[PDB]
Amino acid sequence: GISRDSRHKRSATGAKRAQFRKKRKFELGRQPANTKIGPKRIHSVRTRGGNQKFRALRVETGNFSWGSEGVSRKTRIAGVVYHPSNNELVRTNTLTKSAVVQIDATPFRQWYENHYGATLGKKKGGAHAAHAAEVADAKRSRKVERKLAARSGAAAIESAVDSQFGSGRLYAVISSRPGQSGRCDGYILEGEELAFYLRRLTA
Amino acid sequence: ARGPKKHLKRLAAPSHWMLDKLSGTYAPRPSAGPHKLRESLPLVVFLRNRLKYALNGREVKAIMMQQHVQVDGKVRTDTTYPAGFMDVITLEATNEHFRLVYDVKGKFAVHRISAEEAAYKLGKVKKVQLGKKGVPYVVTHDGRTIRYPDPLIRANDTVKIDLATGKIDDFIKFDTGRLVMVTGGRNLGRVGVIVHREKHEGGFDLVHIKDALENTFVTRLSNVFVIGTEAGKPWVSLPKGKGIKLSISEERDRRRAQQG
Amino acid sequence: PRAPRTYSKTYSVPKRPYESARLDAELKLAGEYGLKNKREIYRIGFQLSKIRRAARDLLTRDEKDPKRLFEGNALIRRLVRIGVLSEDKMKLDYVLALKPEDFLERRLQTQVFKLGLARSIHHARVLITQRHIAVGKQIVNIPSFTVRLDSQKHIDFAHNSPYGGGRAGRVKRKNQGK
RNA sequence: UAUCUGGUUGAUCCUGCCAGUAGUCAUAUGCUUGUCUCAAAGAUUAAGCCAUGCAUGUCUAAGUAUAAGCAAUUUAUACAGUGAAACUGCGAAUGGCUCAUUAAAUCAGUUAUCGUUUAUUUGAUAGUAUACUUGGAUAACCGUGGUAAUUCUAGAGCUAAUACAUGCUUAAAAUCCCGACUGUUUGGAAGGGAUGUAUUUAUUAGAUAAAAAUUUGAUGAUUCAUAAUAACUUUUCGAAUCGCAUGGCCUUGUGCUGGCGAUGGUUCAUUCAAAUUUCUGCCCUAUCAACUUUCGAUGGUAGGAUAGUGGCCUACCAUGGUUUCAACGGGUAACGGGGAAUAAGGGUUCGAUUCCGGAGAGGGAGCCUGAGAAACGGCUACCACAUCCAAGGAAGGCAGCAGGCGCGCAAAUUACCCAAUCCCGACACGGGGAGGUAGUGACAAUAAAUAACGAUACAGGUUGUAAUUGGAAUGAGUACAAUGUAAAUACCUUAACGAGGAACAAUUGGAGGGCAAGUCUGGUGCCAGCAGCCGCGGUAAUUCCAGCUCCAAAAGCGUAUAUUAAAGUUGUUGCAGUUAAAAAGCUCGUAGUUGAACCUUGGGCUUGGCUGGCCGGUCCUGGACCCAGCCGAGCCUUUCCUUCUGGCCAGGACUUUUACUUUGAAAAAAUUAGAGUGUUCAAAGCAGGCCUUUGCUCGAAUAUAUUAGCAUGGAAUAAUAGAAUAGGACGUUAUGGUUCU
RNA sequence: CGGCACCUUACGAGAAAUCAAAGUCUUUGGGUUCUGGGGGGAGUAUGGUCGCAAGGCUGAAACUUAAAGGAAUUGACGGAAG
RNA sequence: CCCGUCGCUACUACCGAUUGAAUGGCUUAGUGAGGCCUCCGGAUUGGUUUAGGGAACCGAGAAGCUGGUCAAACUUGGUCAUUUAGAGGAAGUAAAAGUCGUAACAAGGUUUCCGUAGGUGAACCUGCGGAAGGAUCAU
C-alpha cells in the first residue's frame, strides 16, 4: 500500500532510481483518519511491535487547559474555526493537531466562580446581571470570603479572553494528534498567540 | 531480513572460542543473556572444549539437567547460556569454583578459584540514572540492575557484588593509578595501572595504562575494567601471566628453558 | 557448509621445456640418488627456492629487527635439525648457500644407502617401499622421509621384517615349505 | 629465474607484428589409468519447464484428559500411571537454494539514533484506598449427511482451560481540592471527593564565580531521567493458573499460617535483532552535455501517516537542487565484498560458487497472523504456462533434496541416518534431504608401485653394463577376523592365497629449426597429406604414409578456448612521435597540472640511552671511569614551546586552516606469510608431550591488511591567515563610563 | 645583449642517415599539452556537428593479410655525370 | 618490379522502395481484477437485560453497499534498444594472373609528391599554389 520509502523517489541529482526491491512492511503507511465532530467512534489499530494506535474518527469532547492559571477541564468541542495547513479542513470541520476550535466556556466558567468568586463575560444585559449578582451573593462560611479575598486581584484576566465568555465559547488549539492517540485535547488561546489568531479570523 | 538469525556457521563463531574448522558446519550460537554474543562463551563450549569433561555436544546437556552447573550461584539449564567476564561457574559435584577472566593471550583462561572467592563478583558501572519513583540505580557490565547504590557511585566505576543478595559490598572508584584489566582490542587481557585519562568530548576517551613491566599502551575507555584500587592488589585471583604481555622471542626462550 | 580444506602444490615445472644443459643435470642428480621422476627434483627445487625466499626478505631488513631475528633463527633451527645446514653455518647467509644436493642427502632413501643396509641406491628405495626399514619404533615406507639429526642414528631394519629377525616372507615360506 | 627463440633481405641493423614457451582455485574434450589421503561437481546456454517421493513440527512433576485406548489395583469415588484425538502455547520470518533484477543501488570500512521498534534471555520493578475462587460457549468425542474430486466440510447432542469475557480481596498515615459550622485578625474545623501504574494534554522542579549590608541526578550537548500540579481515557494491569513434599501454632476448627519451583504479567535496563543514517570508495561509454522541476524535483511553514526522523504524503509559499572534479543517459557475456589466477617489483585478469551483506522464489500487485513477513514448502487477483474433472467444479509453483525433459562444448544416486555440529518445540525423551555417511566423480591437490641383488658370459676400463641362470622381498589384488560405523563400505592391522615375459605387459606426443630426439629402411609422387610460424611433398621426403631406433613428461600426456607472464607490444615504475605509426597550420585562452628566492641559524654548558672495545670484570656473558660514534633531553644564548585554579593530574578559559609523515586503536573468520607440533612423510590438522600416570602438562602465536574515519609526536617540504584611510597588539592590577549576570 | 644561421669535433646520443640538440634517457623523474600501437579495409560506412555548396571536424566494424616499412652495404640496371 | 578500368567466380559489409517485420524495456491516455481503509447496512445471537401477551433497548455481528487507496492485466499511442527480409545500386577483399594500356620505380623516358578545381575507357592528364622525401647543399 502506501509506502514512505525514498526508493521510488529520485535522488538529489535528479536521477531516477532503478527498482531495488519489492515494498517492505517495516516502512508502510496508512490512510488518514480524517477526524470529524460527532458521536465518538474510535478504531484501534495494530501497529509495529504489537503496539496500538487509536484512530479517532469522530469526537465530541476533549481535555482543555488554562496554562495561565493551571486548570484543565473536559468540555465539548463545537467545531474548527481555523486550520493553519489547509483551509478546507475548517470547511468540513476536520480535527487534526494545531487546529483552532471553539469550545463551550461553561465548564471553565464554573471553576472561575467557585475559585475566584467573580463572573466572566462582563455583559451588561439583564440575565448576565442576574448571573453576576447570584454568584457574589451566594451563601458561604465566614472564612470562605477571606480565602477568596486572597485570590482577589489576580482574578482579573486579559480582556480578549474575558470578552469571549459572553458568547459562552472559547478559542482553543488542539495539542494532541487525533489520528494517533485517540484523543482531541488542547489548551486555550492566550496572549499574543490568541491576538495573532484573531487578526485573520476577523479579517 | 524477516527476523533474527538463530544459526551460527563454524567460521562465523568468535575467534577466541578456538573451535576447530573441520568439526562441522555450525557453531554454538549464544542465547540472549548478561553478555554480548561476540564477547561471551556458551556453556557447551566450556564443558567440552576447555575442561574436556564432555566429549561431544550431547553429553553436556545431560550434565546441566542434573543441576550441577551454577552461574553466579544460580542454576542454568541452557547449554548455550552466554557466560562472560568475571562470571562464576561452580561445579560442586567436582568441587570446583571458576571465574572467567582473560589470560594475557586474549582468550578465556581456565582459572580455578577458591570456594569463598566464588561468592562475589565485580561489575563495571555502565550508567547511573534515576528510575521510576525517584529511585536511582546502576547497570553493570552484565546488565545487573542494583537499586539504591552508594550515591558516590558514578559511571566507569567497579562495584563488588555479593553475588547472593544482589547488593553492593564495596566499589572501586575510577581514577589515576587504579588497577585495570582490559577487555577489548588487541590489548585485551592486559593488566596495568592508569596513568592519564585523555578526554575526547563527543567521541571515545582513551585510558593510558602502564603494564607490570613498565609497558605503556593506550586503549579505549570501553575496554577498561577496574580490578584493584592500586598496583599489585587485584580484587580477584588473576590468571597465569597477571596481564603481562611478552615478546614472541621471550615466549620462545621461556619455552626453550621450560621443557629443556 | 563445512569450512574448506586448504591444499597447495609442492613443485613447479621449469619455464623452458627442453634444455639439454638442464636435461642432463636433472638426470645426473636423480640418477645417483635413484629418484623416480623429475617431480622429485621439481619438488626439491621448489621447496628450496621458498627457503631462500624466506631468507631473502630478512636480509633486506635492518639487523637486530625482532622479526628478522625471531623468524631468522626459527628458520635456521629447522634446517640444522635436519642437517641441511651445518652446525657452524648459523648465519642466515649459508642458507642462501644451499643446493638441491644438500637436502636430497638427508632423504631416507639416501641415508639407508650410506648406512649400508642395501647394496645400491635403487636397492635403497626398494627396502623402503617394501616395508623393511623402521625408524625408531615406527615403520616408515616413504622414500622421501627426511631424517632429522636425532633420527639419523635410529634407522635400522624393522623387527617384523624378514631381514630383521621376523618370520620368512612369502617366497621363502612357499619354497622352504615346498 | 628479473631469460628469450623462429619468421620481411642477396646479405645487414632496426621498427613491428605473427608464431613459439609456462601457469591458471579454468572450462570442454582426445588418449590412458595400478595405489593412499583429500575432494569440486546443471553457474555459464533457459531465475527454461517439472512426473515421483521427502524437505517443520513440538509435552514436562509443574495448561486442558470420562478416548466407549492401554495397564495395574492404587497413598485416592473429583482426578492421579502411561497415553492416542483435539483445544491452548511456541516455532514455522531460521535453515537450504539461485544470482534474474540491480552501477552511489547493493557492498566495504567506519559513524549516529539527544530520531526508533524489539518475541526471547538475563536481572530489577506492582499493599492503592460470588473471593472457600465468577459466567458461557467450543473442539476432540458421539451420530444424520452431501460432492467425483481435496489437509471441503454441513445439521444435532455434550463437555473442559495459562482459550474467551468479567470481577473483589490490604497497612499506616500523609498530602491536595471543595468545604457546612466556628475562631472572629484569620486559625480550628464536621462532611465530601484524588492518591499505584498504564494513555494524552497543559503547566512547574529539574540550581551551582569565590566574602561583605536548606536538598537537587545524567550528558560534549536536550523540552533528558525522575517528580509534581490540573485533568483525560469505548480504562491497560496491581495472577479466579499448575507440581511435589507436606510442615509449624494450638483457640483441635478441614481453624490460622507456609518450602521449593511451572507458567504468566506493568515498566526499566540488558541481550538476540531490526530500521534508518554520517563520511570516503564501484567496469565500459561523450557516436550520452546538460539533467530534475505539471503529476515532489530543491527548501520552508503547518499538518497527516509512520515505530519513529525525513516531500514519506497533503495544503500553502519561494525557485531551488545535480553537472566537464563527467551529472544525466546507454551497455554490461554486473549481485558486492573477504578472496582466486598470474606475478622481482609495480601491475593484469577473475570472483555464480564452502564466509559476510543483499535480492528473488514464473512476472507483477495486495494483505492475514505474528515481536518479527509485504513470507510464497501463507493466502488473494491478474497475466503465461499448466494437472484432474463426472464438464458442475477443484487443485498448481524444486532459484530446497534426489530425480525427469530441453539447452548446450559443459556438469552425480529418485542411497542411508539423526550417531557427530547445531537449530526448533510444552522439551534430558520428538523433528531436522539443516547436517553427517555412502554411491558416480582422472575439477583440482598429497604421498606413491611396474622391480632389486648376485653367478656365468663376452667387451670393457679395482667394476657399469650387455645376454641365460637363480634364490629372496613385497604389494596391486584376493579373504578370514578385529578395528573402524547409527548400521555398513573404505583406511590401518591381519591368518591363508597372491610374480619370471615377475602377459600383475605405461601411456601421451614427437624426432628440419624454434625444441629434446635419425639425413635409417619401405610405400606415395604437388597427390595424398603434414605443417601453431618458416615451409616439407613435383620418383634418394632429415618434415607425408609405414617399421626400427631415440627423445620429453609419467599415472599421467595432447587438443580447443579464454586469460596471466613472456609484453619495456598499454609503459606510474617503464614505450615511441626528424626519416619506421605518431608534434594540433598558428596564436589567444578557460577549467586542470605545475609554479623564483626569502622569516632562529649558530655558539656554550649539563644530562639520559646503546654500539665498538678499552676496561675484562671471559661463562658469548655483566660495571663507573676512557675514546669516539649514533639518538634523546634540560638549560643560557634578545627566545617561540597556550594560560590560571586545585598543588605531572584534573578542573576550567583560549586556539588560522591544512596537506604530509611516526606510533597507537581498528581493519571478523576463512584464505596468504609464518611459530611450534615427526598427521609413518606429505598434502594436512591444531593437535600434543610426559614411565605409562585415578593426572600433570607448551600450546592453539605473531605479521601483512590500507583507502576513508579516530588519537597521537614533529614543523623541512607545498599551501593557507594576519598590522596600511590601522577598525592593530599589550596595560597582567591603566583610568574611567556603558550596560548584562 | 638578442637573433637568422654556418664550420669542425663527438664528451654523448642514435638502427643508421645524422644530431649543439635528436645530449644531460636501464646511472631510466624540470612542467605541461597533443598524438601512435603490424599492413589493408579506411579517413571508408554510419550517427552527430559546422558549411550555400564543394566539403571540414568527430569516426568504426565485418572481412582480409605475414608481412608492410626505415637506414645503410654489395651487386645488377639507367633513354645520368665524369 | 609494377598500377588501374573491364570480364569471370566467391565471400563480407554498406545504401535501398517496402509509412518492412520481429523481440524486449519504459511510458501518455483509456478501461480496469483484486485486496485494504471507510460508510452504511443488519442473515443471526447473547442479554446492559425489562416487561401483563412480551415490548423494548444494550452488545457481538455475516453477506452486501458508498467513497477512497495500492493497483495487477489489456487496448491504443509514443519512444528507445537488439535482431532480421529486400528488387536493385555501389564498394572492398580473395583467386589466377583473362582483356586494354604503361601510371610509378633510372632525369622511368612529361622529375615526383601535397592541397584544390576541372576533364578523361582505365591507369591518369591539366590548371593554380606549395614541398624536396630532387636530378641542385656550390658561381
Swiss-Prot record, chain A:
Pfam family, one: Ribosomal_S8e
Keyword Magnesium appears in the UniProt entry: no
Gene Ontology CC annotations of this record: cell surface; cytosolic small ribosomal subunit
Keywords from the named record: Cytoplasm, Ribonucleoprotein, Ribosomal protein
Matching CDD domains: Ribosomal_S8e_like
PROSITE patterns reported for this sequence: RIBOSOMAL_S8E
Compartments it resides in: Cytoplasm
Main subcellular localisation: cytoplasm
GO process annotations (BP): maturation of SSU-rRNA from tricistronic rRNA transcript (SSU-rRNA, 5.8S rRNA, LSU-rRNA); translation
Disordered, as annotated region: 1-36
GO MF assignments: structural constituent of ribosome
Keyword presence, Cytoplasm: yes
Record's function text: Component of the ribosome, a large ribonucleoprotein complex responsible for the synthesis of proteins in the cell. The small ribosomal subunit (SSU) binds messenger RNAs (mRNAs) and translates the encoded message by selecting cognate aminoacyl-transfer RNA (tRNA) molecules. The large subunit (LSU) contains the ribosomal catalytic site termed the peptidyl transferase center (PTC), which catalyzes the formation of peptide bonds, thereby polymerizing the amino acids delivered by tRNAs into a polypeptide chain.
NCBIfam families: eS8
Subunit structure: Component of the small ribosomal subunit. Mature ribosomes consist of a small (40S) and a large (60S) subunit. The 40S subunit contains about 32 different proteins and 1 molecule of RNA (18S). The 60S subunit contains 45 different proteins and 3 molecules of RNA (25S, 5.8S and 5S).
Family, as annotated: Belongs to the eukaryotic ribosomal protein eS8 family.
UniProt protein name: Small ribosomal subunit protein eS8
Species of the source: Candida albicans (strain SC5314 / ATCC MYA-2876) (Yeast)
Gene: RPS8A
From Swiss-Prot, chain B:
GO cellular component: cytosolic small ribosomal subunit
GO biological-process terms attached to the record: translation
InterPro entries (alphabetical): KOW, Rib_uL2_dom2, Ribosomal_eS4, Ribosomal_eS4_C, Ribosomal_eS4_central_region, Ribosomal_eS4_central_sf, Ribosomal_eS4_KOW, Ribosomal_eS4_N
Domain S4 RNA-binding, chain residue ranges per copy: 41-104
SMART domains, per the entry: S4
Protein's cellular compartments: Cytoplasm
Major localisation: cytoplasm
KOW domain sequence ranges: 177-210
A GO molecular function held by the record: rRNA binding
Pfam families the record matches: 40S_S4_C (PF16121), KOW (PF00467), Ribosomal_S4e (PF00900), RS4NT (PF08071), S4 (PF01479)
Protein family per UniProt: Belongs to the eukaryotic ribosomal protein eS4 family.
Protein name: Small ribosomal subunit protein eS4
Species assigned in the record: Candida albicans (strain SC5314 / ATCC MYA-2876) (Yeast)
Gene: RPS42
Curated annotation (Swiss-Prot), chain C:
Region described as Disordered: spans on this chain: 159-178
Gene Ontology CC annotation, any one: cytosolic small ribosomal subunit
A Gene Ontology molecular function term of the record: rRNA binding
Principal localisation: cytoplasm
Domain of life: Eukaryota
S4 RNA-binding domain span: 106-177
GO biological process: ribosomal small subunit biogenesis; translation
Keywords for the protein's UniProt record, in alphabetical order: Cytoplasm, Ribonucleoprotein, Ribosomal protein, RNA-binding, rRNA-binding
PROSITE patterns to which the protein is assigned, alphabetical: RIBOSOMAL_S4, S4
Cytoplasm as UniProt keyword: yes
Compartment(s) where it occurs, according to its Swiss-Prot or TrEMBL record: Cytoplasm
Family: Belongs to the universal ribosomal protein uS4 family.
Purpose of the protein: Component of the ribosome, a large ribonucleoprotein complex responsible for the synthesis of proteins in the cell. The small ribosomal subunit (SSU) binds messenger RNAs (mRNAs) and translates the encoded message by selecting cognate aminoacyl-transfer RNA (tRNA) molecules. The large subunit (LSU) contains the ribosomal catalytic site termed the peptidyl transferase center (PTC), which catalyzes the formation of peptide bonds, thereby polymerizing the amino acids delivered by tRNAs into a polypeptide chain.
Protein name per its UniProtKB record: Small ribosomal subunit protein uS4
Top-level taxonomy: Eukaryota, Fungi, Dikarya, Ascomycota, Saccharomycotina
Gene: RPS9B
